[PDB]
Symmetry: D2
Subunit: 116 residues, 4 copies
């Protein structure tokens, strides 16, 4: 799998567990088509979202459901969700790790892109 | 004005100048309706997007064109844009500052919500 | 004044108020010499630390007492303090803004260096 | 080993390789005594710094030599180094991962603390 998402909680100093996320891919008509979805494990990681064959060139959006995460912990956060939108595999297959660090009124996201 | 956006450049240690952005408001059919837009000033700030009477409660999205910013500097970035999606809530303070800190493969965003 | 520090709270989405900090300048024997200090205002800002003629080139450290901040809010933090260590360089712009964004188990710091 | 450090480069979207760091521990007389040191691998991680036996209670400082990292890449950065100062093992043995995300004029650091 060439796409992994890792999420950390900056309040607890822990992986962000059970964070839902939905991945979309832009279609030829400019709409967002559902691509994959899942939730983070005890390690705060989400593996196995897709395959090298399936993960073709395109513009992808990872919607990380941060609001639901905070509310489940009894906290009212600012953002609805964190979105990460990027072109993938423009120059051939790459492996992408999307990392996100969450606080109730702030988040950071970074990408590590490697060539297998 | 109850909404201001400030953008900083983490590579150069400066305001991010001439950064374009569009703000959308979510409609009842779940589509994104254009609301306001503009470009950051020399101070990296965009003021005057809206007024108190216009900025009613609801879900807003600020789509910051970070890709065009980096490309105009001759740097290849990861993200298509940075998105900040949030609910405006009258039960909270009245002034919203959305800040974003940009790197080519990462960004961070924070909300500072205060009362005059 | 060529040096300002601004501190934000990522849990509450607000300026970090009454945050104490000390600035040190590195001496020839590599010890840290007290230089200036103060507490952030209602806007999370500390102005007036130094003057142009006093702020000569050299290595400075800003030690922000983040632990006391979180404890006064009843929150257990990870770090003893946040440190920002940098060289003041006359070949660059004249005004330094050191910003810090605080969470209990994480912080971020950025420098915005500009010319009037 | 109960202490690991991971460093990412926000400009390249890659692990930060060959980053040197020195770890210190506060002595009874309030000086910083050398504790351990090493450099990040191809994965941007530094493992094996210490042992459960050696890593006793205390106040630790991880100095991550970011300036040397950027200069080796022909970039003049703002900070001398990123410091992470924290009390460890206050409530019995824990495992600590210190993560840092680097840009030339900005960095973020976070801690993941787990109970084995
Ligand atoms: O250090 C940060 C500082 C700021 C910031 C916000 C308002 C200002 O008037 C300013 O001078 C800096 O905004 C941020 C916004 C972020 O999303 C992440 C950050 O680390 C910062
Ligand atoms: O997005 C971030 C991602 C990471 C990170 C990435 C991979 C890991 O295996 C890990 O354990 C942490 O670490 C950070 C550390 C930071 O201080 C700020 C950040 O935004 C991140
Ligand atoms: Na191509
Ligand atoms: Na104890």
């Amino acid at each position: 799998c060439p796409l992994m998402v890792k999420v950390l909680d900056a309040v607890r100093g822990s992986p962000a567990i059970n964070v839902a996320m939905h991945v979309f891919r832009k279609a030829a008509d400019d709409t967002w088509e559902p691509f994959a979805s899942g939730k983070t494990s005890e390690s705060g990681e989400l593996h196995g979202l897709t395959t090298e064959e399936e993960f073709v060139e395109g513009i992808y959006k990872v919607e990380i459901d941060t609001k639901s995460y905070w509310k489940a912990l009894g906290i009212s956060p600012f953002h609805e969700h964190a979105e990460v939108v990027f072109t993938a595999n423009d120059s051939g297959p790459r492996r992408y790790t999307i990392a996100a660090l969450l606080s109730p009124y702030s988040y950071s996201t970074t990408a590590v892109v490697t060539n297998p």
